[PDB]
Structure formats: structure tokens, C-alpha cells
């Protein structure tokens, strides 16, 4: 028996049940009018300070988030080399225990950002909330079931979008050029890796109307290379999508990914290399005089 749907159901149920609970609470709050500084604000302020880097504990938490995002991405990269669905012992799988701990920390960081949030519904629809709903619940389900599906785990790469924000929190990024460069690099890499993971999932699991018989055995790095070739418009043709869903995804990505590549790669290359050629200072020579000339130089 296969269990792929249990992981996916846990994410869908989490995202939409939370959204419906929030909307029902709103509805019923106003409906009570038909029948008819606080500690809440103090904990909201404390959570907002923790979320920012205004304290030592907040800085430690932000650095931990930065490290654990890369850790989870590396864990997904390790798992991407295995079969699509498998049975594996939680008590004897160090990577599953490490993932379990990482997702505990992300659940806690999610809880802190929820408490700190001003508009809950606005928070529930912030995309790094969506990234947590589509990546945290399936880890819990896997650790409970003693089984894993390599399903939507490529969405972990979207965690790189917050890197510039948490670098600005840590008082590291100050200049506009550096901020823009980090933003562009993060968006480019996360988009590339996420799209590669999705096309990897879709190619390795065939079309349902073809009874999953036309699947193509493509590795994650092969899909990454194919996406790079497609984005740059080189189009070698050695590697390409063959399933109907894969090609349907390829068509929608060709509209967005080429505009991203054509826009971001020149701008990144302009932002880098902005070095001053004439820097440094003169070194005096003993026994030889020197003359400084300034004013109208042409």
C-alpha cells in the first residue's frame, strides 16, 4: 500500500482548516452583536521583539533560522537521491531525527511569528506561512507513520526568500546595492530549485491517464540542469520533459523563468564587480621627492 496522499492531505487540511477557523472566528465575533495595556499586547510585543533582532535571544533565533533553513534544504537534497516512496525506521534514521528536530524548531518559529502578527488572516496568507504549512505537517506525518514520501519537500528551497530580511534584521545589510543583490540572488536560486523539484516530482511520477507508465527516471540534479538550459534559452534537447504534466509545467515556466533570467542575470552581474580601480594610496620612496597635482585634470 502507498501513503502519498496522507502527507499531502495533512498539508491541505492544515492550510485550509486554519483559514476557515480564522474566517469563522471573524464571522462569529461580529455575530455576537446580534445576541447583544493588556497582557495580550504585552506578549505580542515580546514576540515581535524576538522575531526581530532587537535582543541577543532574537539574534540567536534569527541565526538559527538562517542555519536550519539550509540544513533542511541539504536534507532534502540527500533524500532526492532515494526512491519516491519508502519505509524507514525513525528510531534508526539519523536524518529523520534531524529533520524532526528541525521541523520542531520551525513550528516554534511559526508560533512566534503568529503571536507577533498584527492581522492573523494576513499572516496566514503570507507565503512563508504557506511554505511552513506545505513543509512542516508532512514531516510530522512521516515521523508518525515510520515512512517517507519525497512529495512537496522541494518547497523548502523557498525558505531562502527570508535570508535578505533576516540579514537586514541583524544589521548586516545596509546599502541598497547589497540589499538588491542579495534579494535577486535569493529569489533566483529559490525559484530555480523549487521549479526543479516540482518538475522532478512530475517527471518521476507519470500521467494518471497513461496509468503512470510514461514516467521518466530523472534525477533532481538532472532536472536542475534542464531548468538552467531552458531558462537561458539554450535548449540542448539532450534532457527534456516527456510527460504531459511535465510539458504543461514547462510551458508555464517558459513564460516566467525566461523573463526572470533575462532580467536578473544582467542586473546581478552589474551589481557585482563594482570595484574602484584607482584606490589605494601612494607609497613614498626614500631619497626621491614627489609632487601632487590636482584641480582641472583632463
Amino acid at each position: 500500500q502507498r501513503m502519498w496522499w496522507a502527507f499531502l492531505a495533512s498539508s491541505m487540511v492544515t492550510f485550509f482548516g486554519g483559514l476557515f477557523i480564522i474566517l469563522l472566528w471573524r464571522t462569529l465575533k461580529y455575530l455576537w452583536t446580534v445576541c447583544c495595556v493588556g497582557w495580550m499586547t504585552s506578549v505580542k510585543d515580546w514576540a515581535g521583539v524576538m522575531i526581530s533582532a532587537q535582543t541577543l535571544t532574537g539574534r540567536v533565533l534569527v541565526v538559527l533560522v538562517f542555519a536550519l533553513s539550509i540544513g533542511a534544504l541539504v536534507i532534502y537534497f540527500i533524500d532526492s537521491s532515494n526512491p519516491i516512496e519508502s519505509c524507514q525506521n525513525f528510531y534508526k534514521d539519523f536524518t529523520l531525527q534531524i529533520d524532526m528536530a528541525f521541523n520542531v524548531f520551525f513550528l516554534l518559529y511559526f508560533g512566534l511569528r503568529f503571536i507577533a502578527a498584527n492581522d492573523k488572516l494576513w499572516f496566514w496568507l503570507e507565503v512563508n506561512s504557506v511554505v511552513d504549512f506545505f513543509t512542516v505537517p508532512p514531516v510530522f506525518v512521516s515521523v508518525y507513520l515510520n515512512r517517507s514520501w519525497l512529495g512537496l519537500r522541494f518547497l523548502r528551497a523557498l525558505r531562502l526568500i527570508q535570508f535578505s530580511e533576516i540579514l537586514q534584521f541583524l544589521n548586516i545589510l545596509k546599502t541598497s546595492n547589497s540589499i538588491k543583490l542579495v534579494n535577486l540572488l535569493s529569489i533566483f536560486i529559490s525559484t530555480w530549485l523549487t521549479a526543479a523539484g516540482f518538475i522532478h516530482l512530475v517527471e518521476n511520477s507519470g500521467d494518471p491517464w497513461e496509468n503512470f507508465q510514461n514516467n521518466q527516471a530523472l534525477t533532481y540534479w538532472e532536472c536542475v540542469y534542464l531548468l538552467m538550459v531552458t531558462m537561458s534559452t539554450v535548449g540542448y534537447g539532450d534532457v527534456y520533459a516527456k510527460t504531459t504534466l511535465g510539458r504543461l509545467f514547462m510551458v508555464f515556466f517558459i513564460l516566467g523563468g525566461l523573463a526572470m533570467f533575462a532580467s536578473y542575470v544582467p542586473e546581478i552581474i552589474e551589481l557585482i564587480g563594482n570595484r574602484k580601480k584607482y584606490g589605494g594610496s601612494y607609497s613614498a620612496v626614500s631619497g626621491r621627492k614627489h609632487i601632487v597635482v590636482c584641480g582641472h585634470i583632463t
Binding site: L23, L121, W122, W209
Partner: protein, 214 residues
């Protein structure tokens, strides 16, 4: 890149508070789920159209075997061994001919449509298990179990006089469950998208009544 990296000489009442922005984002989401559900319904509908008609056009029948025999010729199956390892092994060909409910004439039995398409010249294929001896043993085992089935029990069979004109199948190759899930979950996406819009408008309009009440 594309067109010299897009260059070419530079060719080309408000009483509601902050909650308004979260609610307008909730309308957006609910609308996007409505569109997604409808679009995916059409996409899956075009993909299922030919398989579903090729399946619907095949009628159920009652069958009985006329004969079981070998044609003396042999064919390659592929046998597998981890990473990418494969080689080929022979199997002997059986043919089986069967009584038919629509044409009342000779047709050749093929266990399923994948067997028909992988070797239309032959009636059965063994799962390739290394050596030729095990393929021949497994064909002889299936052959003996089919040869004595003479009118024992008119087993049901699937036929299509328009595209399997003298070929007959023992199974449907179209899983009803897989089709059901392909049309159910886009419908669920659409219903969830409607409920999100409805609850968002219900909350938005009750906020105005609860404001005017004060």
C-alpha cells in the same frame, strides 16, 4: 539571451481598519482556487477524453476458448537487475482463439491492452525471470491452465469491433478510481474556493453592521 537580452538599442466609508487587506487577499485566493479548479477540470477533461472513449467503446461479452496452441516462433522479453542493468531472454509464443458475442467469429485473445500492444503477434507474455527455461516453464504452466478451460465456464471478456477488430481482452485497462480522483479533487478545489469567497464577504459585511451598531 532572447533577443540580445531584451536590448536592441533599448527597444522596449473606509471605517474598516487593517483587516481590509487580509480580507482582499482572502478574496484573491478564493477566486484563484475557483479558476484553478475550473481550469484543471478542463485540462484533465481533454487528457481523459481519448482514453475514456477508447474504454467506453469496448463492450462486455461472454467468451469460450476455441483452441490453445504454440506458433513455434520465439520473442524477446527484457529482464532487470538494479540501477540500469537489463538484458533480454526468449519466450515461446502461445496463441489462443476465442468465441465472440458481437462478431460471432474468430478472434485472438490478448490478456490485456498492454500485452496486445507490447506483442500483438502473440497471446501472452511471461514476466521475464532471467533464463529462457523459466520463461518456457511459465508459458507451459499458463498454456496447460488455459488448454483444458473448454466450455468449463463462459468467462467474461472485453471487445471492440471498431479498433480491436479480431482481438479480445480479459481485463479493463482503465482504472475507474484513478479517473474518479482526477475529477473529484479539482471539484473540491472549486468548492473550497467558493466557500472562502463567501465567508470573506460574510465577515466583511458583518464588520460594517457591528461598526454601525456602536
Amino acid at each position: 539571451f532572447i533577443w540580445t537580452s531584451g536590448r536592441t538599442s533599448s527597444s522596449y466609508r473606509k471605517t474598516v481598519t487593517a483587516l481590509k487587506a487580509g480580507e482582499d487577499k482572502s478574496i484573491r485566493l478564493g477566486l484563484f482556487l475557483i479558476i484553478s479548479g475550473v481550469v484543471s477540470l478542463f485540462i484533465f477533461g481533454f487528457c481523459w477524453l481519448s482514453p475514456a472513449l477508447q474504454d467506453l467503446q469496448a463492450t462486455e461479452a461472454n467468451c469460450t476458448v476455441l483452441s490453445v496452441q504454440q506458433i513455434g516462433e520465439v520473442f524477446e522479453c527484457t529482464f532487470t537487475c538494479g540501477a540500469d542493468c537489463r538484458g533480454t531472454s526468449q519466450y515461446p509464443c502461445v496463441q489462443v482463439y476465442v468465441n465472440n458475442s458481437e462478431s460471432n467469429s474468430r478472434a485472438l485473445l490478448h490478456s490485456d491492452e498492454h500485452q496486445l500492444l507490447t506483442n500483438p503477434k502473440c497471446s501472452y507474455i511471461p514476466p521475464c525471470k532471467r533464463e529462457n527455461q523459466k520463461n518456457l516453464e511459465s508459458v507451459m504452466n499458463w498454456q496447460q491452465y488455459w488448454k483444458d478451460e473448454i466450455g468449463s465456464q463462459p468467462f467474461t471478456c472485453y471487445f471492440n469491433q471498431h479498433q480491436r477488430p479480431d482481438d479480445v481482452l480479459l481485463h479493463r485497462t482503465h482504472d475507474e478510481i484513478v479517473l474518479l480522483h482526477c475529477f473529484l479533487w479539482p471539484l473540491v478545489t472549486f468548492v473550497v474556493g467558493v466557500l472562502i469567497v463567501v465567508l470573506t464577504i460574510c465577515a466583511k459585511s458583518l464588520a460594517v453592521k457591528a461598526e454601525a451598531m456602536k
